[PDB]
């Protein structure tokens, strides 16, 4: 399957992998322009289970890893820099495990390397919501999105909240077979021992106020990676890269500037 992708700029290639429910478009409001200004070529794409493949099911982390590898291959950009968030960070982790030759260095945001209890509770709650067929009313769905994704400081800022609520109407997340299958694309076992063999330089970024993927789980991944290090962004929830894009972009661009392509 060809996945839709957007290819911008010329220069050292960086492949962005969005998290569950995110199209490649997720990276364009805040990341791509900054990376273009710094002279990178940016590739974004629609993960399996999004957009044209929203009715796909029965796929696994390995399928998504293969999809990503195929993208890097087909564009002739091996090895590429990789930026991944949540599910996207997991896919990047797992890609570095099987095909380290395709990745020169990586940033992994809001990530984890085992099936921790927070993930278990999330899995169960989401799968249940899906299987029940219940539709959350719109304002209640938006309140849940606000609470799960943003820091305290943002929720206190009246103008910001008005924007994020507007932002939700411009960013609808349809409940699809694809979205449900993506829920399964997460650690099912302790992958930390496997990450101990990843040689690439890696920056793990944890977001301070993250309740979906608490920052301490990112520390575990950075600790396991021989050349990994951990950075924490304050006052950032799970959508830290959208919320504090200046802090997050500075961290990634400083890291990527320090390492060879």
- Tell me the helix, strand and coil percentages in the chain, rounded to 5: 50, 15, 35
Q: Does 206 bind a second copy (CB under 8 A)?
A: no
Residue 166 as a binder of a second copy (CB under 8 A): the answer is: no
The yes or no reply on residue 211 touching a second copy (CB under 8 A) is yes
Was 238 annotated as part of a binding site? yes
Q: How far is CA 65 from CA 68, 182, 206, 243, in A?
A: 5, 12, 22, 27
Restricting to residues 126-145, name those near a second copy by CB under 8 A.
126, 128-129, 132, 134-140, 142-144
Does position 225 interact with Na ion (CB under 5 A)? The reply is: yes
Question: What would the two tokens of residue 138 be?
Answer: 């719109």
- Residue from 21, 228, 237, 240 touching Na ion (CB under 5 A): that is 228
Q: What are phi and psi of 232, to 5 degrees?
A: -115, 135
Identify whether 67 is a catalytic site residue: no
In the set 46, 67, 209, 210, the catalytic residue is 210
- Judged by beta carbon distances under 5 to 8 A according to partner kind, the member of a second copy, Na ion, none in contact with residue 228 is Na ion
Report which DSSP code applies to 9: -
Q: Is 119 annotated as a binding residue?
A: yes
Q: Is 234 in the site for a second copy (CB under 8 A)?
A: no
Q: Does 257 bind a second copy (CB under 8 A)?
A: no
Q: Binding residue per annotation — 86?
A: yes
3-state DSSP assignment of residue 229: strand
Find the helix packing angle between 138-149 and 158-170, rounded to 10°.
120
Q: Does 189 bind a second copy (CB under 8 A)?
A: no
Helix extents (H) in the chain:
32-37, 61-74, 87-98, 117-132, 138-149, 152-155, 158-170, 177-182, 192-195, 215-224, 240-243, 245-258
Is 210 a residue of the active site? yes
Task: Pick the binder of a second copy from 5, 168, 171, 216 (CB under 8 A).
Answer: 216
- Among 90, 79, 88, smallest CA distance to 44 is for 88
Which are the catalytic amino acids? Answer: 86, 210, 238
Binding site for a second copy (CB under 8 A): 116-118, 121-122, 124-126, 128-129, 132, 134-140, 142-144, 146-148, 152, 155-156, 158, 161-162, 165, 209, 211, 214, 216
Residues of this chain that interact with Na ion (CB under 5 A) are 225, 228
């Amino acid at each position: 399957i060809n996945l839709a992708y957007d290819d911008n700029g010329t220069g050292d290639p960086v492949v962005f992998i969005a998290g569950r429910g995110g199209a490649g478009r997720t990276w364009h409001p805040h990341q791509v322009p900054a990376f273009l200004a710094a002279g990178y070529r940016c590739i974004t794409f629609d993960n399996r289970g999004i957009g044209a493949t929203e009715n796909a099911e029965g796929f696994t982390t390995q399928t998504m890893v293969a999809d990503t590898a195929a993208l890097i291959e087909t564009l002739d950009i091996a090895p590429a820099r990789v930026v991944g968030v949540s599910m996207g960070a997991f896919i990047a982790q797992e890609l570095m495990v099987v095909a380290p030759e395709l990745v020169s260095s990586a940033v992994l945001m809001a990530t984890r390397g085992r099936l921790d209890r927070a993930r278990q509770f999330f899995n169960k709650a989401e799968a249940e919501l899906y299987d029940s067929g219940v539709q959350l009313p719109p304002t209640y769905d938006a309140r849940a999105r606000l609470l799960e994704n943003f820091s305290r400081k943002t929720l206190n800022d009246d103008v910001a909240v008005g924007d994020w609520i507007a932002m939700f109407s411009m960013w609808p997340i349809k409940s699809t077979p694809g979205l449900r299958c993506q829920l399964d694309c997460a650690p099912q076992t302790n992958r930390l021992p496997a990450y101990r063999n990843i040689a690439a330089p890696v920056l793990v970024i944890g977001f301070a106020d993250d309740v979906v993927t608490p920052p301490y789980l990112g520390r575990e991944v950075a600790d396991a990676l021989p050349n990994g290090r951990y950075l924490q962004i304050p006052d950032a929830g799970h959508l830290g890269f959208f919320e504090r894009p200046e802090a997050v972009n500075t961290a990634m661009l400083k890291f990527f500037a320090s390492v060879k392509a």
